[PDB]
Design a protein around this ligand. Sequence first.
Ligand SMILES: *CCC(=O)N(c1ccc(O[C@@H]2CC[C@@H](N)C2)cc1)[C@@H](CC(C)(C)O)c1ccc(Cl)cc1
Length: 148
Amino acid sequence: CEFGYIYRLAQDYLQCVLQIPQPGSGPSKTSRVLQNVAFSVQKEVEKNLKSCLDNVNVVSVDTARTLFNQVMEKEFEDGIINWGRIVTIFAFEGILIKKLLRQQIAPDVDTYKEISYFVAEFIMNNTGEWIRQNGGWENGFVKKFEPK
Ligand SMILES: *CCC(=O)N(c1ccc(O[C@@H]2CC[C@@H](N)C2)cc1)[C@@H](CC(C)(C)O)c1ccc(Cl)cc1
């Protein structure tokens, strides 16, 4: 269930940014902690990198996937993995969602689940083993970022 858990975190973050809460039992405790930390990092990246983010047009899910993979390959190229870098992946997906909502040439809600897929694929394939060895999401991420 490793991929599915990360896909659900990425989808919950996307629904948070788009302000489209899905009814039912709601997000898990990991998801709730992740949403505040990643949103804080997202607003900081948006502010600092506004000029260069504004020069790019996210016109399709293919462009979002390509930009996500190029930016995240560079973010992790030195071989270091830490929780802050993992929170930045979610923050970056939130930026791409916002730009896609503004500039997607043929708007399609069913294409938003493609973003949660390519975020989960990157996390699983590049950081999954480190995540497990550092406590997973409940004994690693939550313990580190939950309120004291
Ligand atoms: C001003 C930087 C820039 O041109 N790009 C960019 C690089 C990295 C980045 O975010 C990561 C995560 C937070 C930071 N630690 C760095 C955001 C923007 C562009 C990269 C290109 C030129 C494509 O390689 C860029 C611009 C706009 C978008 Cl939507 C994506 C990437």
